[PDB]
Design a protein around this ligand. Structure first.
Ligand code: MNB
Ligand code: MNB
Ligand code: MNB
Ligand code: MNB
Lengths: 171, 171, 171, 171
């Protein structure tokens, strides 16, 4: 037998423990188009039709964006775009109204409600109109059979839509 | 009614979705002491007794370390230190053996097994001995009623011990 | 050395693996009171004030119900009741409207919106009025600093309110 | 305006909230074969070779068992069986020893250690030998690239092996 003293300099009294962390993935699309018909006399939307290029997704990360395009997500090869079609705008007042439309994600379509909040209506510098509104609402992954392989535990079943728009009159 | 065109520059077609992420918290203790009796003739440990100052924890983060000291973790005010006491070393060969001892965390004591792996035995530059071994093993939070408030979901019930030691002869 | 044959009858080739499962806790309250002023000429609510006895919770399980009363949940000793006070009803049509009111849980108050859906308005058998409506909406635990000890991982931050009411005229 | 009183009999003041629950899946295999060479003079294993029919899995549930056979698990069509081959038994004493062998799951092979605990050695009623031992150890899903599609969050990366054997001498 013999006696030793630790060399604290090259000794590590260590442990590893596994924990979970919840975080929001925030994201948008760089490439989309829309048709907007709005009546500032009454603060009513008349037609709102949006097409989004799935390809142009951005969640501030280069490799997860590619993965979104694959079979277990968007399947962008087969279904390159997602679309929203307004069916009904029910005004609450000049600032607020309930929008109902058809959302289509990878060929599956469901009718959703978004909360329209009008942030500002104006006649601009040049005497031509502008508006700044938002559309907000929660859709369920399950309702669109979207990313069915991924469990509702790992990734929430709820997606929260926040569409923030500035827009000017045409021609 | 009137027609608008989005100003893509001040429009954001956005979404938020919640996901979970699993990660290892790695950590050690900066301040501990040990008594080590080892016989290089036979590669057997004779006595190994460690005292760790809970206060000196480090998981590479200043604020979680403080939180570890609180009631729902270490309770360092009441139980400032954790201790290991070897009871039995069962040699497998010169590189490997099974160590059995008493671990005490916040006043609760249980007998654990660690896997001893001898990385190197030597007579040094100056003709005095050295050794470099490791002790590895999994303990269960539940076995020590440790952090009972925190669910086995958020934080694993398993803690993985990795004690890496370099040490030299005494006097 | 010697050769053996398993007795399949008293041999078990076994394994254990840990998995997570997501489930809805559904619940209601057995004991509450309300004041309801409604105008069937216009399908508008005028006053809606509810008081719920936290004590009377029921999630189909005797022991979790008790636990709900404790400090890390309702604190029913200090805050025996939760209250809702209508501030504003904004009609959409005769079937649908947006209700805004003050919810109070354990002394913390916040203004919420519920979606009112009128399932049926009637003059009854005896020529006295009835109505059957629902109130639906999502509140956030975090908004009320409710059950702060429990992580948003183990238990959702979102509570989904579904108030289903049948009601008859007074005196 | 008009005043109503709830019909408590057909009124439900209700809520739904999502929570996670951790549970052990326990399981075994009904159909396997083994070759066992053991020396009761020294309490050493000499040869231990097991073949397990993946098909015969049982986790007390008819539909999850089928799912285990599919591509995202065992792929039983391609890889019908899992095998263990002992390479080395290192005795600790007559009750305990460390077993090292090759585990193969769906064509991927890795060397594992199991803790052998001898529960009983005997010469039976009829003067022929018996033994009753157990083999215990943790393997990692990731080490065998097993069920790669399923996240380490939903299902633990750790599988815990508990092989409980009774066995009698041959011919
Ligand atoms: S367009 C856009 C890019 C990145 C992010 N993001 O922060 O990950 C957003 C967003 O917050 O919606 C939008
Ligand atoms: S002593 C020490 C400090 C920090 C870390 N760490 O990486 O968080 C370790 C470790 O990896 O064990 C040790
Ligand atoms: S009042 C009531 C009791 C039990 C349940 N439950 O199913 O757990 C409910 C509900 O579904 O809302 C209501
Ligand atoms: S062979 C066998 C069948 C069922 C179970 N089970 O309880 O799910 C076991 C086990 O506990 O190992 C074994």
């Amino acid at each position: 037998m013999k006696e030793y003293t630790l060399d604290k300099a090259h000794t590590d009294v260590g442990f590893k423990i596994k924990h979970l962390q919840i975080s929001n993935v925030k994201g948008c699309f760089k490439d989309y188009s829309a048709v907007i018909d709005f009546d500032p006399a009454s603060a009513e939307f008349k037609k709102l039709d949006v097409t989004i290029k799935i390809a142009s997704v951005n969640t501030e990360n280069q490799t997860r964006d590619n993965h979104l395009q694959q079979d277990d997500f968007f399947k962008a090869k087969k279904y390159p775009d997602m679309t929203f079609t307004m069916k009904k705008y029910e005004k609450i007042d000049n600032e607020k109204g309930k929008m109902t439309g058809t959302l289509t994600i990878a060929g599956v379509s469901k009718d959703i409600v978004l909360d329209a909040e009008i942030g500002g209506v104006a006649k601009g510098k040049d005497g031509k109109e502008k508006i700044g509104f938002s559309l907000n609402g929660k859709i369920k992954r399950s309702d669109f059979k979207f990313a069915t392989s991924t469990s509702t535990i790992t990734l929430s079943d709820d997606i929260n839509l926040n569409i923030e728009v500035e827009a000017n009159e045409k021609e």
